[PDB]
Design a protein around this ligand. Structure first.
Ligand code: HC4
Length: 125
């Protein structure tokens, strides 16, 4: 395990520039998106929660393609606002239900330090 807790205050610094293998060591799901929602990174813990294959989703659009249940004001709307302001930092519960048994999660979206990059962290609740 990487020794990092979900929700930690400086998570963006600890995860800055992490390679794919290190991201796979986290206790929680971690996705990195560009400002349009294209998937740049997707870790093993996320794939175990959602069923998606972390290798196959890279390059797909999270809102248009992988996760249409998040294409709503309550998820995508918050993402795109926080991308626009440059200070996205929001934590909220949500249910994932596309082509899967519904599962309720806690989501933490936070701007990454690297350019045009935004984290989406997920754990079960
Ligand atoms: C709703 O369509 C949610 C889908 C989903 C959420 C998170 C993922 O990592 C993959 C699919």
């Amino acid at each position: 395990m990487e020794h990092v807790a979900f929700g930690s205050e400086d998570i963006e610094n600890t995860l800055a520039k992490m390679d794919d293998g290190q991201l796979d060591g986290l206790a929680f799901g971690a996705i990195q998106l560009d400002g349009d929602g294209n998937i740049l990174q997707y870790n093993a813990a996320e794939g175990d929660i959602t069923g998606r294959d972390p290798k196959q989703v890279i390059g797909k659009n999270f809102f248009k393609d992988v996760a249409p249940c998040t294409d709503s004001p309550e998820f995508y709307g918050k993402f795109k606002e926080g991308v626009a302001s440059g200070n996205l930092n929001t934590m909220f519960e949500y249910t994932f239900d596309y082509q899967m048994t519904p599962v309720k999660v806690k989501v933490h979206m936070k701007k990454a330090l690297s350019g045009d990059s935004y984290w989406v962290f997920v754990k079960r609740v």
